[PDB]
Write a protein that binds this DNA or RNA. Structure first.
Ligand SMILES: [Mg+2]
Ligand SMILES: [Mg+2]
Ligand SMILES: [Mg+2]
Length: 167
RNA sequence: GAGUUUGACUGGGGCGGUACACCUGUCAAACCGUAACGCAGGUGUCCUAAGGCGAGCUCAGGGAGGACAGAAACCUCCCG
């Protein structure tokens, strides 16, 4: 039945910078040029002396795309990765992700003002009906025979993009 | 030189301690109450919100994941 078709719920991009300041506000404009929307700064939960991060200090930026624009950014991300992901990239909960080492390959032209940054592409899959565990009125679990496994996630990647999955 | 004062509790007194005004657990023996210089601790503060109300949200931790990134940075899902 068509009520089991795997789809892209959201594409969550993450640029975790080591420190704040001008170095962080440059990465915010990178996600704005790619996702076309204002990013969200993530403050540090705790303080780490070795990492050089203080509590409640913005160190990262993240976005999330839902509609056809999420498939656009994923296609540009999978093109840089040559449409091949390792078998361990797929989580047992049905999701997967990969890392991009430089945003210049995604379609953003390099400029001397802002530096080069690496993103963190993570795709959250789902079936039509996965919203029952997120709504407030009459919330319910998804179900055993309806949640996506690791096998269906890898098979979906080998069919929509015909990607290669290395052992 | 004159007058007066130089606390109390206290296994004598002094020294020490404050059991001297208060709070929690226990002692305490299933109502309450109940002693010892019994036991283990706290108090002379702090807060324009850490008061009041409404709304949304869910925590600790763990599993699986995801460029740098690692036993600990951030993103995601699941259990909780
Ligand atoms: Mg006399
Ligand atoms: Mg006496
Ligand atoms: Mg009693």
């Amino acid at each position: 039945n068509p009520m089991r078709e795997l789809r892209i719920r959201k594409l969550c991009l993450n640029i975790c910078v080591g420190e704040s300041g001008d170095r962080l506000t440059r990465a915010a404009k990178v996600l704005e040029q790619l996702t076309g929307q204002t990013p969200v700064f993530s403050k540090a939960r705790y303080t780490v002396r070795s990492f050089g991060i203080r509590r409640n200090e913005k160190i990262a930026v993240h976005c999330t795309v839902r509609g056809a624009k999420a498939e656009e950014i994923l296609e540009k991300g999978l093109k840089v990765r040559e449409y091949e992901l390792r078998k361990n990239n797929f989580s047992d909960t049905g999701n997967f992700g990969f890392g991009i080492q430089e945003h210049i390959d995604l379609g953003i032209k390099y400029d001397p003002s802002i530096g080069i940054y690496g993103l963190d592409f993570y795709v959250v899959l789902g079936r039509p009906g996965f919203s029952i565990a997120d709504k407030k009125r009459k919330r319910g679990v998804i179900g055993s025979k309806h949640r996506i496994g690791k096998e269906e996630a890898m098979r979906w990647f080998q069919q929509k993009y015909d990607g290669i999955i290395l052992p």
